[PDB]
Symmetry: C2
Subunit: 280 residues, 2 copies
């Protein structure tokens, strides 16, 4: 069989992990993605090949084809799949989108931070983004706090933004961002690994963060704490050889302890967009 | 003539600069500071040797000896002069003091910053000093703002402080800090290059800063603005091979811009006294 983007989705639905599909596609390369089901089951390295195959055969192709086609997609096999993202560990094998794929061709910068951000924190992000002078596409995860402030700031400056989410492209999270998700979803770009109707499950968020970081050469931090999600994203981005740009804060409040730890560990302290641009 | 501490003061009063006296004392070493006036005038490298010698002879020794003896002193020739301060360019040749010289025997850290700091800036300095756990003598210049908060934090913790002033030991600048200067002079140590009745002249402050930095193995910055006095002290401390520990702040205020610039340039970002202690050069 020819492994198409629909087949990649069908393999995920049959129980194959992203790492298992990566092994299959790695082998399938020098054979033009023309592999037998018994070989796919073998190459994948899954526990019970007979269980995977049974799950594959039980799939109602008519009902799955409708589901797969609800939102457009692209895979690691497609030419449009960005270079920086392919280089990461566990690179997403298939991504569903809503918007203009042309945004993936321009230079990108990630922006992460506190879900419960201060008014100070949000202004700091805006100030840094304005100073970027629309030279970079703002990549963030649409969650409450500085993610929202980073999206809004790139929009107001007359530039372009990419959102990457932890739900299906039809589900909205956080509930308040429905309008903002819909807007970027038309004029800009919203990316997701999750199919229609998939819920904001806890594990989807650290997973989604891997894509935010992976898409960009650098990550901008603001108001990150000592054992926060933003810190984990930056520490993992540093491991992928990506630049971390940390915005400092007060040593009294506790809101910027992660940013300060990152700067001590080698990250670049940033005060303006020019500080970010000087490194890029 | 034998160059004594009184003679060093008399040379400063005759028009010789600190660098000029430093050249004289360097040459005078292998001759046990026994040089004649014509040689002192020559070695110093002053523009007009005849004018220096004239001025030296016009000095009323009785009036000057009373002035010199008003407050005790020590010079670069004395055993008590700290070795770290001797290593700087243009090391003070003579220092007048008020207090306990024993404080010069302990490990010291400089604390510099904004004259017009914020309440957050002062609390940042207090937090970092508290975390030092009285392991270091707090060296600062008695200026309003960060300097005052540095001295008070040392005092409250039950620690020791050294003040380096830009006036005479009987002059108080700023006027509001009189009680603090008087107390530091009583229980701690106040140092000055300036003789009795000398006023807070603008140039006295950058000069005084060279001693604050020179005395210590590290400098702590808080709320240093761009093109500020605190930044200049740190940039020169970095040139002298001293560690600079910068306390970060908001990127909005403009207050911590100098601290942020220093961190970018290689200075250590600090959040506690433990962060300072972790990287501090002791012996």
């Amino acid at each position: 069989m020819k492994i198409t983007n629909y087949e990649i989705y069908k393999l995920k639905k049959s129980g194959l992990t992203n790492q298992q599909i990566l092994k299959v596609l790695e082998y399938g390369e020098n054979v033009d993605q023309e592999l037998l089901l018994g070989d796919i089951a073998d190459i994948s390295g899954c526990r019970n090949p007979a269980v995977f195959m049974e799950r594959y055969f039980q799939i109602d192709d008519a009902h799955l084809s409708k589901e797969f086609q609800k939102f457009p997609s692209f895979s690691i096999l497609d030419d449009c799949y960005p270079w920086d993202l392919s280089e990461i560990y566990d690179a997403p094998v298939l991504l569903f989108y809503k918007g203009n794929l042309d945004l993936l061709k321009f230079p990108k910068v990630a922006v992460v931070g506190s879900r419960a951000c201060s008014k100070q924190g949000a202004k700091s992000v805006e100030k840094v983004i304005q100073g970027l002078e629309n030279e970079l596409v703002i990549v963030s995860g649409l969650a409450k706090g500085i993610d929202t402030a980073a999206h809004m700031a790139a929009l107001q400056n007359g530039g372009k933004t990419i959102a990457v989410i932890g739900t299906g492209l039809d589900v909205f999270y956080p509930k308040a961002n429905k309008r903002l998700q819909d807007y970027i979803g038309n004029d800009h770009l919203v990316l997701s690994e999750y199919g229609p109707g998939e819920q904001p499950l806890k594990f989807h968020f650290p997973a989604r963060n891997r894509i935010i970081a992976g898409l960009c050469r650098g990550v901008i931090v603001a108001e990150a704490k000592m054992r926060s999600g933003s810190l984990i994203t930056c520490e993992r981005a540093m491991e992928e050889g990506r630049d971390v740009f940390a915005i400092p804060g007060s040593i009294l409040d506790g809101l910027s302890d992660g940013c300060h730890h990152l700067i001590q560990e080698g990250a670049k302290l940033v005060t303006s967009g020019q500080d970010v641009l000087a490194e890029f």
